Amino acid sequence: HRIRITLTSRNVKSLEKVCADLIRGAKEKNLKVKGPVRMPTKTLRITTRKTPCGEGSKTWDRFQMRIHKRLIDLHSPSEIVKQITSISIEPGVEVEVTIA
Amino acid sequence: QPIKLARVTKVLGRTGSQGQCTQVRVEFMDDTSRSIIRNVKGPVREGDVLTLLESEREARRL
Amino acid sequence: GPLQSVQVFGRKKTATAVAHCKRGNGLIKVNGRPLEMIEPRTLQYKLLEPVLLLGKERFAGVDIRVRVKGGGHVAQIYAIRQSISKALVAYYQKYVDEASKKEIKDILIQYDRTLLVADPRRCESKKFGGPGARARYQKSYR
Amino acid sequence: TPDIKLFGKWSTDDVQINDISLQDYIAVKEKYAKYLPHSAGRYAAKRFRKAQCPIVERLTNSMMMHGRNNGKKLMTVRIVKHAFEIIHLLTGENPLQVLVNAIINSGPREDSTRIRRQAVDVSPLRRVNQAIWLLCTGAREAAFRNIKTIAECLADELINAAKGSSNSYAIKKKDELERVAKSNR
Amino acid sequence: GVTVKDVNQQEFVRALAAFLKKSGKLKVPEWVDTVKLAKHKELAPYDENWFYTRAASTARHLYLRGGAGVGSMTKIYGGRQRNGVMPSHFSRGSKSVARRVLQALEGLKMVEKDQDWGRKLTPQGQRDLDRIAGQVAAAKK
Amino acid sequence: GRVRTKTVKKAARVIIEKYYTRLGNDFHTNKRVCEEIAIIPSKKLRNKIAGYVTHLMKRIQRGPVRG
Amino acid sequence: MAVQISKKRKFVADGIFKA
Amino acid sequence: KGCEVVVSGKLRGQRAKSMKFVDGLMIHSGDPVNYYVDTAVRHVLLRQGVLGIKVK
Amino acid sequence: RDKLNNLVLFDKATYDKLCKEVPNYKLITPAVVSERLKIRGSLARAALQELLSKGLIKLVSKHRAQVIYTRNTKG
RNA sequence: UUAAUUCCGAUAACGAACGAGACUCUGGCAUGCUAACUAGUUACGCGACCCCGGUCGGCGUAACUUCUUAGAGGGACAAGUGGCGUUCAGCCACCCGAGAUUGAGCAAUAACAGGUCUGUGAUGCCCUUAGAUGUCCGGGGCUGCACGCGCGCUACACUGACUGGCUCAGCGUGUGCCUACCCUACGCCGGCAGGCGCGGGUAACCCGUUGAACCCCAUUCGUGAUGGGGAUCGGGGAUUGCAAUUAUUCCCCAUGAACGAGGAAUUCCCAGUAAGUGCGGGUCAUAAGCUUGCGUUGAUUAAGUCCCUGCCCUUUGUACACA
């Protein structure tokens, strides 16, 4: 019963907590599990000038966006995960639940 | 006319239109007791040797 | 008896070089071929310096198969030279006395401290308003 | 062999630097003897670290000059090996005595400066730095638009500069850089 | 014995070219003396019998890194393009003449076409790279 | 140019004044004696303060400290 | 949706819905 | 803790202007500005023209 | 101003001077032989193959862009 | 005294605050911690070849986390010694060390008749509104060329240009709402540019171990304006597109100009820096001589001054205040 809670997020320190919760509450029912397997972070990037024309010296703004991923791997029934997931998440992160 | 060396004992300061020269108080290694201030190009440290062409000259202190 | 598997690195610019010391015959080699035939062929003495200083006595009971990747051509000859120096110091610390470990360390740091500690240097980035890190495009008036 | 490292294929024993005014910054024998001139260095650090670097290495750095040349250190070790193959055959000396004799005769004892004007003395570190630049360039402007090779040209800047003959680009620059300093004092 | 990796690889491609001329079943093209090696050249190859040197180089590259198609063999011998008054850029080798080298060695059972992409070396053809590795090392010492 | 702002020396004499007993000469120990009691929101600012302390703790051993 | 988009493309058309 | 309030446009003239009402503490640089301070702007269309209201 | 009308091939005046004078010199090269004896760059590499196959000269170690030959040993 | 109105100290002022620091992102050190079939390598069987060993990016799943990714914590503070100095406020030299100043963002009070109504369903006033300056459709133009300036790209060669052979990167990018438009392995038909099929990728999963360039090894050129240089210009052929003429880009032949290192004047730059070299996004049906990014090779010189251009504090002098 391989199940994969793949967490994608923009937040470094709300993610941390939502992946913790899933592992705090797996070992009380106690159903054996893999550990937090990360992925390589992406910085998208856009650059632009600052002005509404072409006047002045040419200065440059540089807008980033670090986009941060986790994943954790369960051996458990999917009805057991209906309970688990819906219990307590937060706005910073959205959760996927790969079933097999 | 004589050609000789001279060893450094203490630097003074930094002179010349552009801060280009230095001014170093020397101490002789031919005779063990004589000295004369002279302007020097290049970058001098303290504890090194020079090689002159004429030995009499003496540059005016600032 | 047991085994003695030691696996030590040493970067240069943008590139590790993880060695693989173990008990066996004297044979050092780098991705299948020995150290005396890896191109280019200018710096012949760089790969061959670690063995001549310390002598061939240290490599009469140690087999090695070195790997590379990253950096460039002249930033991988320094990489594998900085690896086999630090791996041989690690292999003779715990397993035997330390009086052989420190007396190998006296030979390498006096000659070239780059053998046991890496250059922390790296590529300074480009800013706008010019080509590179510090140059600025040609200016003018009038 | 913890005693004698062969400089590529060249010895280090019994080298004669008769002048004590240049017998610290010129580093090569005994403690500062190696196989390659090529260097990761870090002499571009303090003020004076530069003096702690090998002198045959300095020159290699020096060679790689003018756009196309700039940065190709491998390729100008090339030049300097093949430059030490011709000094050994043409006269007979160990190269590392011929190159040491050419730096002391090439850089100036006095260098005119701008205070209105008056001449001034040199530092030691001046004379190394000047000489070497002044016997790279000399080769350069012989081997350009000409069938002679760089090895050979560079090998026609080090046999008649130690000699001090004043036909060379090294020793006639030493004639002019000091005569301007005798003019205005 | 001796292997291809330990033997000096500059002389190794000159050695197997003498063994290719020895056999006489390479299937050479019918436009060899009027073909340019890539688009990114000006003139043709200097060697008047150049198909017998480069038929070796396709074989001793597939020992190291197998499973290679034709495409990657246009990127294997990579090059520039000194582009007149405008700057230099990367230009891929050649589909047809690199595809002619694979089919030169396909009738003569050496490079079989397997799965996981591309060609490789067949077991009984990989042998004749390690045997001549002994003949090249018996006149260098 | 290692000179420390009034944010440092304000919070150093105000940490020597009360707890002269607990504190001392070691940099690596009062690094903990400055952190157990106080509120300090940066590790760099934590180290600047806890070592002028050691700079100021060796001056009580010679003469009377002003502030 | 049916055609299945990119996560980059997905986290950004989020931002423009909000604004 | 404090505040700053600028009003800019053509108040009482055929030329323009900008007022700048203030009191309390205010910071302008470094990290902290975002979470510690509060910025907003709204333009406004009177009969003559347009005014701009930098409330911070 | 002036030009190097250099010999592509050997004259009999410039062939009798290669077998006799060139082995006596201390450094035989692709650029010093082309100056003294008045010959091209493509000719001074085509002739030194015949001196070494016979056994009249002593080659040091050839580079892609320089070869050096010397005067031959006593034995 | 400081890089600093930065701190010591004095004091008809007292207690404050802005800017500067502090701070956020980044680069460099952890064989210690948390952990991995979207990442490794050892360990261990099976197959292939060479004469017990060696070599497999050929095939698998008995133990680990050094490599790889990225979380948590640590770590450097003028701390430890020696001289200098109100012995304070500091600083220069040496040991220990991964570092004893790594680079960016953010940024005050006073102003400018600086630029932008051609970024706006931000805007006053004025103009014009059916023979419209609204709007759409068809054709040209913005490139039109004696001359003058400004950023750039390619060389003038032998430390080279031509033809073969060997061995190494890093930032990212990728199938879209009107929107039609992706990145491409394998396999054939062709000198080339391409074409004719077949996959795999919403991506640490497929392109990809991103077989990148200068650099390297060996051939052939010979001091010639030459195999240096490659403008101009004739004839064929492919590809994007509703349309290529005023040649969109690309390919094959042929032609084969100046230029032999550029007078007065002049710009940028101190270490992984300058300089060379190549590779990605932007723009884009078609698409880099320009802009924003990354790695590779890797330098000579200096640790100074106020002479020449300018900025900050004080004393000084004015008939200037549109200075």
Coordinates of N, CA and C (backbone and C1' of nucleotides) in Angstrom, one line a residue, chain J residues 261-302:
Chain J
rA261 P 51.8 48.9 -39.2 O5' 50.3 49.3 -38.8 C5' 50.0 50.3 -37.8 C4' 49.5 49.6 -36.6 C3' 50.4 49.5 -35.4 O3' 50.3 50.6 -34.4 C1' 49.0 47.6 -35.6
rG262 P 48.9 51.5 -34.3 O5' 48.8 52.3 -35.7 C5' 48.9 53.8 -35.8 C4' 47.6 54.4 -36.3 C3' 46.8 55.1 -35.3 O3' 47.1 56.5 -35.1 C1' 45.4 53.8 -36.7
rG263 P 48.6 56.9 -34.4 O5' 48.5 58.5 -34.3 C5' 49.6 59.4 -34.2 C4' 49.4 60.9 -34.5 C3' 48.5 61.7 -33.5 O3' 49.2 62.2 -32.4 C1' 47.8 62.1 -35.7
rA264 P 48.7 62.1 -30.9 O5' 47.9 63.4 -30.6 C5' 48.5 64.7 -30.8 C4' 47.5 65.7 -31.2 C3' 46.4 66.0 -30.1 O3' 46.9 67.1 -29.2 C1' 45.3 65.6 -32.1
rA265 P 45.9 67.5 -27.9 O5' 44.9 66.3 -27.8 C5' 44.0 66.1 -26.7 C4' 42.7 65.5 -27.2 C3' 42.0 64.5 -26.2 O3' 41.3 65.2 -25.2 C1' 42.1 63.6 -28.4
rU266 P 41.1 64.5 -23.8 O5' 40.5 63.0 -24.1 C5' 39.1 62.8 -24.5 C4' 38.8 61.3 -24.5 C3' 39.0 60.5 -23.2 O3' 38.0 60.7 -22.3 C1' 39.9 59.3 -25.0
rU267 P 38.3 60.3 -20.7 O5' 37.5 58.9 -20.5 C5' 36.2 58.7 -21.1 C4' 35.9 57.2 -21.2 C3' 36.2 56.3 -20.0 O3' 35.2 56.5 -19.0 C1' 37.1 55.3 -21.9
rC268 P 35.5 56.4 -17.4 O5' 35.7 54.8 -17.2 C5' 34.6 53.9 -17.5 C4' 35.1 52.4 -17.5 C3' 35.9 51.9 -16.3 O3' 35.0 51.8 -15.1 C1' 36.9 51.1 -18.2
rC269 P 35.7 51.9 -13.6 O5' 36.7 50.7 -13.6 C5' 36.2 49.3 -13.7 C4' 37.3 48.3 -13.8 C3' 38.2 48.2 -12.5 O3' 37.6 47.3 -11.6 C1' 39.5 48.5 -14.4
rC270 P 37.9 47.3 -10.0 O5' 39.5 47.8 -10.0 C5' 40.2 47.5 -8.8 C4' 40.9 46.1 -8.8 C3' 41.0 45.4 -7.5 O3' 40.6 44.1 -7.4 C1' 43.2 46.0 -8.5
rA271 P 40.2 43.4 -6.0 O5' 40.4 41.8 -6.2 C5' 39.3 40.9 -6.3 C4' 39.7 39.6 -6.7 C3' 40.5 38.7 -5.7 O3' 40.2 37.3 -5.6 C1' 41.7 38.8 -7.8
rG272 P 39.2 36.8 -4.5 O5' 38.0 36.2 -5.3 C5' 38.2 35.1 -6.3 C4' 38.4 35.6 -7.7 C3' 37.3 35.5 -8.6 O3' 37.4 36.6 -9.6 C1' 39.0 34.1 -9.4
rU273 P 36.7 36.6 -11.0 O5' 37.0 38.0 -11.6 C5' 36.4 39.1 -11.1 C4' 37.3 40.3 -11.1 C3' 37.8 40.8 -12.4 O3' 36.8 41.7 -12.9 C1' 39.6 40.6 -10.9
rA274 P 36.1 41.4 -14.3 O5' 37.2 41.8 -15.4 C5' 37.4 43.2 -15.5 C4' 38.8 43.5 -15.8 C3' 39.2 43.1 -17.3 O3' 38.6 44.0 -18.2 C1' 40.9 42.5 -15.8
rA275 P 37.5 43.4 -19.3 O5' 38.5 42.5 -20.2 C5' 39.6 43.1 -21.0 C4' 40.6 42.1 -21.5 C3' 40.0 40.8 -22.2 O3' 39.8 41.1 -23.6 C1' 41.7 40.1 -20.7
rG276 P 38.6 40.4 -24.3 O5' 39.2 38.9 -24.5 C5' 39.8 38.6 -25.8 C4' 40.1 37.1 -25.7 C3' 38.9 36.2 -26.0 O3' 38.6 36.1 -27.5 C1' 40.2 35.4 -24.2
rU277 P 37.1 35.9 -28.0 O5' 36.7 34.4 -27.6 C5' 37.5 33.2 -27.9 C4' 37.1 32.0 -27.0 C3' 35.7 31.7 -26.9 O3' 35.2 31.0 -28.0 C1' 36.5 31.8 -24.7
rG278 P 34.3 31.7 -29.2 O5' 32.8 31.6 -28.8 C5' 32.1 30.4 -29.0 C4' 32.1 29.5 -27.8 C3' 30.8 29.3 -27.1 O3' 29.9 28.4 -27.7 C1' 32.5 29.8 -25.5
rC279 P 28.5 29.0 -28.3 O5' 27.4 28.5 -27.3 C5' 27.2 27.2 -27.0 C4' 26.9 27.0 -25.5 C3' 25.5 27.6 -25.1 O3' 24.4 26.7 -25.3 C1' 27.2 28.3 -23.6
rG280 P 23.0 27.2 -26.0 O5' 21.9 26.9 -24.9 C5' 20.8 27.7 -24.7 C4' 20.6 28.1 -23.2 C3' 19.6 29.2 -22.9 O3' 18.3 28.6 -22.7 C1' 21.7 29.6 -21.8
rG281 P 17.0 29.1 -23.7 O5' 16.5 30.4 -23.0 C5' 15.5 30.4 -22.0 C4' 15.4 31.8 -21.3 C3' 14.7 32.9 -22.0 O3' 13.3 32.8 -21.8 C1' 16.7 33.7 -21.0
rG282 P 12.3 33.3 -22.9 O5' 12.7 34.8 -22.9 C5' 12.3 35.7 -21.9 C4' 12.9 37.1 -22.1 C3' 12.6 37.8 -23.4 O3' 11.3 38.3 -23.1 C1' 14.9 38.2 -22.9
rU283 P 10.1 37.7 -23.9 O5' 10.3 38.3 -25.4 C5' 10.2 39.8 -25.5 C4' 10.9 40.2 -26.8 C3' 10.4 39.5 -28.0 O3' 9.2 40.1 -28.6 C1' 12.8 39.8 -28.0
rC284 P 8.2 39.3 -29.4 O5' 9.1 38.5 -30.4 C5' 8.8 38.3 -31.8 C4' 9.3 37.0 -32.3 C3' 8.4 35.8 -32.0 O3' 7.4 35.7 -33.0 C1' 10.7 35.3 -31.5
rA285 P 6.2 34.7 -32.7 O5' 6.5 33.5 -33.7 C5' 5.6 32.4 -33.8 C4' 5.8 31.6 -35.1 C3' 7.2 31.6 -35.7 O3' 7.9 30.4 -35.2 C1' 5.6 32.2 -37.3
rU286 P 9.4 30.5 -34.9 O5' 10.1 31.2 -36.2 C5' 10.5 30.4 -37.3 C4' 11.1 31.4 -38.4 C3' 12.3 32.1 -37.9 O3' 13.5 31.3 -38.1 C1' 10.8 33.6 -39.0
rA287 P 14.4 30.8 -36.9 O5' 15.1 32.1 -36.3 C5' 16.3 32.6 -37.0 C4' 16.9 33.8 -36.2 C3' 16.9 33.6 -34.7 O3' 18.1 34.3 -34.2 C1' 15.7 35.5 -35.2
rA288 P 19.1 33.6 -33.0 O5' 20.2 34.7 -32.9 C5' 21.2 34.8 -33.9 C4' 21.9 36.2 -33.9 C3' 23.1 36.4 -33.0 O3' 24.2 37.1 -33.6 C1' 21.5 38.1 -32.6
rG289 P 25.7 36.8 -33.0 O5' 26.2 38.2 -32.4 C5' 25.9 39.4 -33.2 C4' 26.9 40.5 -32.9 C3' 26.3 41.7 -32.2 O3' 27.3 42.5 -31.4 C1' 26.9 42.2 -34.5
rC290 P 27.2 42.4 -29.8 O5' 25.9 43.2 -29.4 C5' 26.0 44.6 -29.2 C4' 24.7 45.2 -28.8 C3' 24.2 44.9 -27.4 O3' 24.8 45.9 -26.5 C1' 22.5 44.4 -28.9
rU291 P 25.5 45.4 -25.2 O5' 24.3 45.0 -24.2 C5' 23.6 46.0 -23.4 C4' 22.2 45.5 -22.9 C3' 22.2 44.5 -21.7 O3' 22.4 45.1 -20.4 C1' 20.7 43.8 -23.4
rU292 P 23.5 44.5 -19.2 O5' 22.6 43.5 -18.4 C5' 21.2 43.7 -18.1 C4' 20.6 42.5 -17.4 C3' 21.5 41.5 -16.7 O3' 21.6 41.8 -15.3 C1' 20.2 40.4 -18.3
rG293 P 22.9 41.1 -14.5 O5' 22.5 39.5 -14.5 C5' 23.5 38.5 -14.6 C4' 22.9 37.1 -14.7 C3' 23.9 36.0 -14.7 O3' 24.3 35.7 -13.3 C1' 22.7 35.7 -16.6
rC294 P 25.8 35.4 -13.0 O5' 26.1 34.0 -13.7 C5' 25.4 32.9 -13.4 C4' 25.9 31.6 -14.1 C3' 27.4 31.3 -13.9 O3' 27.6 30.6 -12.7 C1' 26.8 31.1 -16.2
rG295 P 29.0 30.7 -11.9 O5' 30.1 30.0 -12.8 C5' 30.4 28.6 -12.7 C4' 30.7 28.0 -14.0 C3' 32.1 27.8 -14.4 O3' 32.9 26.8 -13.7 C1' 30.8 28.6 -16.3
rU296 P 34.4 27.0 -13.5 O5' 35.1 27.1 -14.9 C5' 35.3 25.8 -15.7 C4' 36.1 26.1 -17.0 C3' 37.5 26.6 -17.0 O3' 38.4 25.6 -16.7 C1' 36.3 27.8 -18.6
rU297 P 39.7 25.8 -15.7 O5' 40.7 26.7 -16.6 C5' 41.2 26.3 -17.9 C4' 41.9 27.4 -18.6 C3' 42.9 28.3 -17.8 O3' 44.1 27.6 -17.6 C1' 41.5 29.6 -19.2
rG298 P 45.0 28.0 -16.3 O5' 45.0 29.5 -16.2 C5' 46.0 30.3 -16.7 C4' 45.7 31.8 -16.6 C3' 45.8 32.4 -15.2 O3' 47.1 32.7 -14.8 C1' 43.8 33.1 -16.2
rA299 P 47.4 33.1 -13.2 O5' 46.9 34.6 -13.1 C5' 47.9 35.7 -12.9 C4' 48.4 36.1 -14.3 C3' 49.0 37.5 -14.3 O3' 50.4 37.5 -14.0 C1' 47.3 37.4 -15.9
rU300 P 51.0 37.8 -12.5 O5' 51.5 39.3 -12.7 C5' 52.8 39.6 -13.2 C4' 52.8 40.7 -14.3 C3' 52.9 42.1 -13.8 O3' 54.3 42.5 -13.6 C1' 51.3 41.9 -15.5
rU301 P 54.9 42.6 -12.1 O5' 54.0 43.8 -11.5 C5' 54.5 45.2 -11.5 C4' 53.4 46.2 -11.7 C3' 52.8 46.8 -10.4 O3' 53.6 47.8 -9.9 C1' 51.1 46.2 -11.9
rA302 P 54.5 47.7 -8.5 O5' 53.5 48.3 -7.4 C5' 53.1 49.7 -7.5 C4' 51.8 49.9 -6.9 C3' 51.7 49.5 -5.4 O3' 52.3 50.5 -4.6 C1' 49.7 48.9 -6.6

